[PDB]
């Protein structure tokens, strides 16, 4: 397999998205992206519940809709976030190990 | 929306051609519409202004005549700004969705306590109206009035299965019509006559839609509302009833078919005429007493014009309309 | 980084010949037999513009008959046939094939491949699309005529019991064949991106047109099988006596759900590639990089995900779909579609804009499409769509929006890549005449339709009464419709004249600041695209190739943050 | 011992197979003419005999 | 091909989420503008769509795990790393147009529902696909 | 000095094509399930599945999975470079696929013999559209195997013919999976 880092002289700065340490290939990141997109549906759910309540309907279930909305939103947000961070770990240690960010 | 629009000529521009609306929920929808156009015009103005700024400030000849050089500043990323410009749309559409849910839940409710229920049948290519229920306070005689014609409804109910055994659709006959409604007082539209549905003012009304063959749609632009009328609405899980809390003001209002249904789709018009509460009691009493009398005669009897006014029947001749006059008049 | 030896006896490779110098017999048998992706792309584009003229002629007949209240020369049946076939031709024989034609031409030039993955499957896609077109239009040769149930083919109106003519069958097999063409093209493009990129052309160095072609290939592969399945179900029902779409089987809404699960992703399949063409054009004439490149990729893929969940906002007035779910989903997919405008403004922000024809067409696209999308969010809200569904307001919405993408940005692509395609430029003055005619005619046609739709006119109405109050609006709209129809006369003349007598291109990049790789090769490219390849390091290699003194500058200015890693130490040691 | 086709490439046995369903040693399609072949060849070893045709004028 | 294989898990997770959400919602939630009950078209459609993206993501990942570091998947590749053979590509073929014509004959037979047209179109189609797939292998004539 | 491993391009194309064929069958399954919902709304569906013949369907299921195992043995033969093992196993797979389609044709003939037709019920319509499209896909698969045998008869067995054989095996695995799913829905849970 190819080495961990490649030859950069001083003064050279790359465009380095597909590098081996970039979170755009580490699989955790894209799952976290999926879950972060998915979390917004729970915000939609709680808003639908509260809006239906405010005009006097959905009265037998709007508290349950609010509960499932907020818990779905928060668990998707949380596990998607931590998955993003687990994808972005190698780049962070790269940024520590050398002065290079780009 | 509860909040009224700005009104005046500004309101006339903002509502952008919408009728004023002859129900309370039409007023709510029109309000919401005008406010979302205040928002939309703000967005459109500022972004068209950016596209004009591009024409008149960010040009290359203007930049070269003031010594900017060959290239601009090769900026490509601004993580905070391209975050903020994404997060602001989200919190915009969330508020839009909140108000959307409020208005939709008010319009779409089925707990308005209807006093008059009309059974509507669409077919290729006209309408049939009939009074299913008229609760007592305006009913003929004062007792809560049911409209079903039991013999004819029973014939339609018996058409649910073929005696010769050709029953392919889940055990039922292919030409089942037991979902359709047959009442005693009915008005039936024809190529020669527009069907005029008479209704009372200030009364909660229910409409019950269905079609004899093909999908149609029941668009009254003055209600600011339409729904599709289907054949076998329950097999399609299509909610076939809708309710309005009242019609606020009386008059004659056009209504059109708003789903493609074939050749004469554009000729499938009806009129919704709205009269006083006591005048409607008189109309329904007259029709119930002498059921041979027509719709025009009852309309004359309560002091209204016999035939529709907001719309007219079409000349059926396939060429006579060529020089403009496509409407045939009635006495 | 290695450096070659200044080799002896070196002279640049020979330039291929431009168009218009052809001997007789040079393209007949080649057309019939070629597997060259770029001749196939030219054939796609010519074919789709011919169908554009057909469908638009149908539309101008529609506008002529709506000019005054009575039926002056058309019947109700013929008007129904006309709008049905106008819709079908413009969406399935102009739109999708021009998408795949532009993809076929420029994509292997953008990623640095010689061919596409499956050349004969590419040829098959072209020919099956042409046969689908011929089949679909053959219905007009019957005595009864074409299909007349709208391009949506709603049921039970599409059952044999309710539409028995043979044209109703021909329409089905037409759209089926066109879908077969699309899936062939989609397979090709996806494999070609996965398997034939150039050295150093990593995924996050491809241009944005390539990314959009990626995601729309995925969408097309999702959806076109489903349309073929549903429509062969309809043809099964009609021919064999089946009952799947029987109304008592819930068949009406079965059809509507299936159709729109195909059909909304199809309008995104038509929108995204032309957004990509505009994202190619805008940075070239601003002399500035494409702003927010990775963010644009994420927005594109976000649309690709969301498009499969927003489908049933075409069914709000059916009284049979859960309203808040699809309303919220539509409100969400509005967000990444709108982020693209912010990125294009960032690409123009304090640039050095020059107004050649493609920049004019692209900014006209932006101005046109903004209003269409603003109109779209009103339909996303069911309280408003209760009034606006199947009104002329909807016509105005999707015409603003489908002209914004598939017409304005299609002409932008034509002007932008005509030099590369042919080795010749087009006449800039005739292009500006084309643009202003199209612009004036278009806004004069479809702006006033918002008002007449709000006022109560339904769509698909052959005839109306002079008491409705619709007449004056229809008259204004039809006058500007004929103007918009005249707009194609300078366009056809410009293409024809410039193809054989146009100004010759003497440079690899006649606009000067070409970002993508297609401007690193000659005009026209050789048979296998590249006589030599440059170092790919940015997402705009051609710019780095032609202006090396800028390669220090852009890397310093790329980010707003105060990144200091141009003073970082050496990393690695030696090998490469 | 098991059979191998005479047109099949020889290979390092540690490197698996010439081709398998997931992977190949080439970016496009393998050639029908054997990838072990190197083209062009001499016209003498293609066997094409170019005719000499004279028609009456 | 790492990023390509991995970005297919965004839409997979999203479409699976929307499938389960849509299913539970359409069966349990009630509003006055629809009838309660699980909506089977959107259910099957979304789960099979997540199946398609799952299919591509999993196959491409299972391939990616045993392909070498290619120059086109490398940030500092030299242009001479792909020097050599790239692969075989068809230079020309009459059989794509032939296949389109076969499918046209089949489709018009289906339209009119002439049985002989359906038979002949299917025969033409199998023939033309076979001749396409035998193009670069037909023997030299042995006379 | 040796050459790098790359994705087999033809396999990638075949897998993309098979993904979109799965999405074809999605729609027929959705039609089936909508029909089944309407049919269980008044208990008529069960009276139409009272014509089914589960042991025989399980038999032809066993035959089809055996044929898929067979074509994978042929894949192994191909990738080793052996034309004769491939040429044996693919013929066995063609025999087993022929047996499948003949058994399915007999199943149709007996179902028509006592009621079930496209026109007699909604159940018959759904049943015959789904199983008939699948049988057409099986017939296209055996056509594919025969064309492979011709290809390796009259062209030398290079890796280019081996890749063709392997992707035709992929196609047969797809039809086998579609059958397992269709068998699980229309015969077991019904
Ligand atoms: C088989 C028939 C046959 O043998 O015909 C050969 C014969 C060509 O002559 P040849 O002797 O073989 O070669 C010498 C040519 O001069 C060599 O070709 P050429 O020099 O004529 O150049 C190719 C040709 C153009 O190519 C062709 O004509 C052949 C390819 C297209 C054919 C398939 C689609 C046709 C439409 C189908 C609609 C149904 O160029 C033009 O005609 C001028 C440019 C295009 C304007 C004219 C077309 C107007 C409608 C399209 C508007 C497009 C808007 C701009 C889009 C951007 C363009 C870059 O005629 C055709 O190819 C006719 C094509 C069918 C019409
Ligand atoms: C439905 C059934 C469809 C046909 C069978 C299933 C197709 C896939 C089979 C496995 C596969 O991928 O093989 C590729 C593989 C080609 O490998 P290769 O020669 O190494 O090609 C490398 C070149 O780079 C190749 O580059 P190239 O571009 O020069 O060659 C393109 C070539 C090969 O392309 C590929 O290998 C890559 C793409 C995968 C193939 C399919 C592409 C998409 C086909 C058109 C669009 C979708 C059509 C959907 C139709 C169903 C609608 C419900 O495309 C084909 O041969 C595909 C067949 C054309 C179908 C046209 C639509 C009708 O096939 C073989 O070598 C085996 C030979 C036999 C295969 C075809 C057998 C057809 C038999 C049925 C005919 C239809 C009648 C059915 C009647 C039923 C009873 C009434
Ligand atoms: C049972 C049912 C029937 C089907 C079963 C099969 C029947 C064929 C078997 C009998 C022959 C047995 C002997 C044999 O093996 O012969 C193989 C013999 C060729 O052997 P080969 O050695 O492989 O030839 C290739 C050499 O490289 C060629 O080397 P070359 O360069 O020396 O020769 C070039 C040759 C190559 O062309 C051919 O040999 C035939 C060209 C077929 C394509 C035609 C255009 C399709 C457009 C769509 O072309 C020409 O000589 C020029 C002729 C004009 C070509 C077409 C131009 C388009 C306008 C006409 O095959 C044929 O000639 C069969 C062609 C059949 C075409 C497919 C069917 C198309 C359907 C018609 C379209 C109708 C419109 C549809 C829509 C509307 C419907 C209402
Ligand atoms: C190229 C082809 C198309 C594109 C792209 C397109 C985009 C949208 N459409 Fe659409 N459309 C609908 C909604 C939208 C929405 C929300 C968007 C969005 O993509 C729009 C987003 C784009 C923008 C350009 C937004 C503004 C941009 C910016 C940068 C500002 C930030 C945005 C904010 C703050 C959100 C705006 C908020 C405001 C308060 C204004 C709906 C329902 O919500 C229906 C069905 C209605 C019915 O059945 O009557 C519909 C119907 C159609 C048809 C019907 C054909 C038929 O006969 O049935 C076609 C062909 C079509 C094409 C296309 N449409 N559309
Ligand atoms: C990409 C997709 C589309 C494009 C582009 C498009 C372009 C137009 N459309 Fe449209 N369309 C309508 C009007 C137009 C007009 C006027 C144009 C224009 O772009 C057409 C002009 C374009 C041309 C390309 C014309 C070429 C001109 C020629 C060939 C003649 C030039 C020569 C002249 C004038 C003589 C020279 C005279 C001298 C004095 C020199 C209208 C209403 O005015 C409706 C609703 C109808 C109804 O009743 O609901 C409609 C319906 C649809 C539908 C729904 C179909 C359905 O409901 O079943 C779709 C999907 C669609 C798509 C598209 N449409 N359109
Ligand atoms: C399917 C789901 C589709 C995606 C939906 C949105 C979710 C994606 C964006 C946020 C979540 C992902 C975290 C980012 C991971 C990542 O790539 O890091 C940022 C990267 C910076 O690169 P670098 O500095 O090298 O460090 C990372 C190693 N490459 O990248 C950057 O340079 C970041 C630049 C800032 C802006 C990024 C994205 C903006 C999103 C635009 C609209 C998204 C539309 C979604 C709907 C609303
Ligand atoms: C080529 C493309 C199209 C594929 C082939 C076309 C369809 C194949 C034959 C159709 C004829 C048929 O099977 O008709 C139904 C048949 C007889 O029906 P009937 O005459 O009513 O007999 C009553 C007496 N018991 O009796 C039966 O119902 C027998 C079962 C028939 C099974 C149908 C198999 C194929 C279905 C899917 C493909 C058809 C696609 C639609 C056509 C386009
Ligand atoms: C293998 C066998 C395949 C070839 C069979 C050819 C005979 C055609 C045939 O079967 O004709 C009868 C057929 C009746 O239709 P049928 O398919 O039986 O299906 C029921 C109808 N839906 O009829 C049809 O479907 C239409 C046949 C009519 C063909 C055109 C007739 C007018 C023009 C003919 C001009 C003369 C012939 C020119 C041909 C040679 C030219 C060089
Ligand atoms: C054989 C090659 C295909 C030729 C064309 C299609 C076959 C003929 C056909 O479909 O004829 C129709 C007829 C029944 O159709 P019919 O009931 O008339 O439909 C309208 C009124 N209900 O059909 C029949 O009654 C015949 C049914 C058998 C048709 C053979 C289909 C071949 C594919 C399925 C094979 C099944 C396993 C054996
Ligand atoms: Cu109608
Ligand atoms: Ca007129
Ligand atoms: Cu949509
Ligand atoms: Mn509708």
Residue numbers in the entry:
A (entry chain W): 11 to 112
B (entry chain R): 29 to 359
C (entry chain Q): 2 to 577
D (entry chain X): 17 to 73
E (entry chain T): 1 to 143
F (entry chain S): 16 to 205
Study text:
Here, we report the high-resolution cryo-EM structure of the cyt bcc-aa3 supercomplex from Corynebacterium glutamicum, the prototype for such a complex. The dimeric cyt bcc complex is located in the centre and on both sides, a monomeric cyt aa3 oxidase is attached.
We purified the cyt bcc-aa3 supercomplex from C. glutamicum and determined the cryo-EM structure at an average resolution of 2.8 Å and a local map resolution up to 2.5 Å. The semiquinone transition-state analogue stigmatellin36 was previously used for Qo site characterisation of the ubiquinol oxidising mitochondrial cyt bc1 complex37 and was added to the supercomplex prior to cryo-EM grid preparation. The cryo-EM map clearly resolves stigmatellin bound between FeS and haem bL with respective distances of 6.9 and 12.7 Å. One H-bond is present between the carbonyl oxygen atom of stigmatellin and the FeS ligand His355QcrA. The other is present between the hydroxyl moiety of stigmatellin and Tyr153QcrB, whereas it is H-bonded to Glu272 of the Qo motif in the mitochondrial cyt bc1 complex37. Taken together, the binding position of the transition state of menaquinol and ubiquinol oxidation and thus the structural basis for electron bifurcation is strictly conserved. We identified two pathways for proton release termed Ex1 and Ex2, which start at the catalytic site marked by stigmatellin. In cyt c oxidases, dioxygen reduction takes place at the binuclear centre (BNC) comprised of CuB and the iron Fea3. This catalytic site is resolved in detail in the supercomplex oxidase with azide bound at the BNC. In the supercomplex structure, azide ions are resolved in the centre between CuB and Fea3 in protomer 1 and closer to CuB in protomer 2. Here, the cryo-EM map reveals the position of a dioxygen molecule in a pocket formed by side chains of non-polar amino acid residues of CtaD (Trp152, Trp172, Val176 and Leu93).
